[PDB]
Write a protein that binds this ligand. Structure first.
Ligand SMILES: *[C@@H]1O[C@H](CO)[C@@H](O)[C@H](O)[C@H]1NC(C)=O
Ligand SMILES: *[C@@H]1O[C@H](CO)[C@@H](O)[C@H](O)[C@H]1NC(C)=O
Ligand SMILES: [Fe+3]
Ligand SMILES: [Fe+3]
Length: 679
């Protein structure tokens, strides 16, 4: 009360040597109110994970594979610090796994069978665990032992660290399948030589491996990469043509106990002091007693892992999927029919219950799964637990930084050709009361505000984007006196006007009554000085059309819009008095389901779209009661997106800019973690 020493787990005799030498040296230049280091010794990395889980140790650095095993029940560890490997200014932490090949050898990923493979080694990420994991279900039966089936798949290979007596075929190119730099084709660089030399047809390596072996691009153009869509790309389009995105070397911590922040403090203070080129006393990435003790010797320092980043996310879908398949042999029995059912992500129980009903009517084509925030749902879509949800533009943006794709837009304009008509978008406006004559778009300092939610187009990204372009700081909660912006930090002023109780207060879901367009507006009625909503929200909640007590008798007449020019006009005059265009909300998913989601959803909306009336008794998809459940209440249909299937491409060039301009101000723990993976 308080303890500060980090109980670091060591493997070798040698590693335990440096661990205490590391402790001694920290004590020389770090004060007593800072972190120290203690050492625990166990027989292998396997024991260390067990150690940290049972709270008899705190941290250890691991390769991607062991990171997976560590996250598993009952270990439940999570990655907290990352080694990086480039310059301080463009630090490289992850590496993408790729399958390199000679230019114009006329085959794709789905034709690897019967070709000659070059690998880095067994247990290795890019050279084995990724390719074989992702090719697992095309391997011939029996797939036990894996090595045999792999041998039976390729027409000859080099598999390092494997066994040549049991399986000879893995060695035709490495006659002595040697787990050592002795054998010429070992590891990243050797595996590539294999391909370069002609031994093999495909080599499995990092994206950087080629660049480290061919400095000149005229040489690189003689190679290509195999993309997962059974197509080829040039070696410098790794980012859009890789297998999986491995992390290099990760310190992991207890998911509950920790000590997460401490671990960072120690390591950050370590790299400041004895890191790289730092001191000539102690060397954190070098040694006397053998190499890669505690950390890799090519490591240039550390970076903290954003707290939103659990292991599933860190390792990433394609990795996790890969390494899963290696252990649990689940493949379709025998073929996957055509389109299994879609997991829609309900936002807490209000949406769940609508979802659950939607499910019943769909005869097994739509399953429901809920999370309590949308970011949580987004992450669920990323990791496989979920498949699809519809999102405000500002959150499609985030989804898109997280590598998810817009599949179909919502459309709000009545038309005989609704499904095949891209709409320019809806209009973000700023609504106040006629009664409050005093207010103007300039005069807002020290007034009270109501937002749909943080990170949404009309409720945040647009209004605040502008505000930031004026005031020049992110502290919006000080420019306003107080407000309601569900998703704000519980003790900002922008949570003071929200209406939820007590944990639910300011929570960015329907349990909070000022959430969304209706909620933002209601906030304006009861508590605030200005709502930031879409252009239709007033009509939609006045003149009796919203029957709830608070809305029953409010009149359109009673409200006005603030225009940018400083003047103010009635609600219907939004075309002449809006803040910006807002990209229509849209549905998003991951690439491998874009197909089935587009198919199922048109199948689905023809049954339950705005065509249908007598919605009571029937199930009607796009009508909720004032709460935009699953979809906005005024959705007319879902529009196709031909070649407009990318968050940048979909949202357009204006919106992506404006949101980008706000990057500095972002508060979002998911955006941090996704752009950490990489922007
Ligand atoms: C709605 O449909 C009309 C019909 O021609 C079309 O011109 C327009 O793009 C759509 N949007 C608005 C705001 O009128
Ligand atoms: C409802 O409207 C759409 C619009 O053309 C139509 O395609 C669909 O078939 C209709 N509903 C049903 C249940 O078929
Ligand atoms: Fe590797
Ligand atoms: Fe919106």
């Amino acid at each position: 009360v308080p303890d500060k020493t980090v109980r670091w787990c060591a493997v070798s005799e040698h590693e335990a040597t440096k661990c205490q030498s590391f402790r001694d040296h920290m004590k020389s230049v770090i004060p007593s109110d800072g972190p120290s280091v203690a050492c625990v010794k166990k027989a292998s990395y396997l024991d260390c994970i067990r150690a940290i889980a049972a709270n008899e140790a705190d941290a250890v650095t691991l390769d991607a594979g062991l990171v997976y095993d560590a996250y598993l029940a009952p270990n439940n560890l999570k990655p907290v610090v990352a080694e990086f490997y480039g310059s301080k200014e463009d630090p490289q932490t992850f590496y993408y796994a790729v399958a390199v090949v000679k230019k114009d050898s006329g085959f794709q990923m789905n034709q690897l069978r019967g070709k000659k493979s070059c690998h880095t080694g067994l247990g290795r990420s890019a050279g084995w665990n990724i390719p074989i994991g992702l090719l697992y279900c095309d391997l011939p039966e029996p797939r036990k032992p894996l090595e045999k089936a792999v041998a039976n798949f390729f027409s000859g290979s080099c598999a390092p660290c494997a066994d040549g007596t049991d399986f000879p075929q893995l060695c035709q190119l490495c006659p002595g399948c040697g787990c050592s730099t002795l054998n010429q084709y070992f590891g990243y660089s050797g595996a590539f030589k294999c391909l370069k030399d002609g031994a093999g047809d495909v080599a499995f390596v990092k994206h950087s491996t080629i660049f480290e072996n061919l400095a000149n691009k005229a040489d690189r153009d003689q190679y290509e990469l195999l993309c997962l869509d059974n197509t080829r790309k040039p070696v410098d389009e790794y980012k859009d043509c890789h297998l999986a995105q491995v992390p290099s070397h990760t310190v992991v911590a207890r998911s509950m106990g920790g000590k997460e922040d401490l671990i960072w403090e120690l390591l950050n203070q370590a790299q400041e002091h004895f890191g790289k080129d730092k001191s000539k006393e102690f060397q954190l990435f070098s040694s006397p007693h053998g190499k890669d003790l505690l950390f890799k010797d090519s490591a240039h320092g550390f970076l903290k892992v954003p707290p939103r980043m659990d292991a599933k996310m860190y390792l990433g879908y394609e990795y996790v999927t890969a390494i899963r398949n290696l252990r649990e042999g689940t493949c379709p029995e025998a073929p996957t029919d055509e389109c299994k059912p879609v997991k829609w992500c309900a936002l807490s129980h209000h949406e769940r219950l609508k979802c659950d009903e939607w499910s019943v009517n769909s005869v097994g084509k739509i399953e429901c799964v809920s999370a309590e925030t949308t970011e949580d749902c987004i992450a669920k879509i990323m990791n496989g637990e979920a498949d699809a949800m519809s999102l405000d533009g500002g959150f499609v943006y985030i989804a898109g930084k997280c590598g998810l794709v817009p599949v179909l837009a919502e459309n709000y304009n009545k038309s005989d050709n609704c499904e095949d008509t891209p709409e320019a978008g809806y209009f973000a406006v700023a609504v106040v009361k006629k009664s409050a004559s005093d207010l103007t778009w300039d005069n807002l300092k020290g007034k009270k505000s109501c937002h749909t939610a943080v990170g949404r187009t009309a409720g945040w990204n647009i209004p605040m984007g502008l505000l930031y372009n004026k005031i020049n700081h992110c502290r919006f909660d000080e420019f306003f006196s107080e407000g309601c912006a569900p998703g704000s930090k519980k003790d900002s002023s922008l949570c003071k006007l929200c209406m939820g109780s007590g944990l639910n207060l300011c929570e960015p879901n329907n349990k909070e009554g000022y959430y969304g367009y209706t909620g933002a507006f209601r906030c304006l009625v009861e508590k605030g000085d200005v709502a930031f909503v879409k252009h239709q929200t007033v009509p939609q909640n006045t003149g009796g059309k919203n029957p709830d007590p608070w809305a029953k008798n409010l009149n359109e007449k009673d409200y006005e819009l603030l225009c940018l020019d400083g003047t103010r006009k009635p609600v219907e005059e939004y075309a002449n008095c809006h803040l910006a265009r807002a990209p229509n909300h849209a549905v998003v998913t991951r690439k491998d389901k874009e197909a089935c989601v587009h198919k199922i959803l048109r199948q689905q909306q023809h049954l339950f779209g705005s065509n249908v009336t007598d919605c009571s008794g029937n199930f009607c998809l796009f009508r909720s009661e004032t709460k935009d459940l699953l979809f906005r209440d005024d959705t007319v249909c879902l529009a196709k997106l031909h070649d407009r299937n990318t968050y940048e491409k979909y949202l357009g060039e204006e919106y992506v800019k404006a949101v980008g301009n706000l990057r500095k101000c972002s508060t979002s723990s998911l955006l941090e973690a996704c752009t950490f993976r990489r922007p």
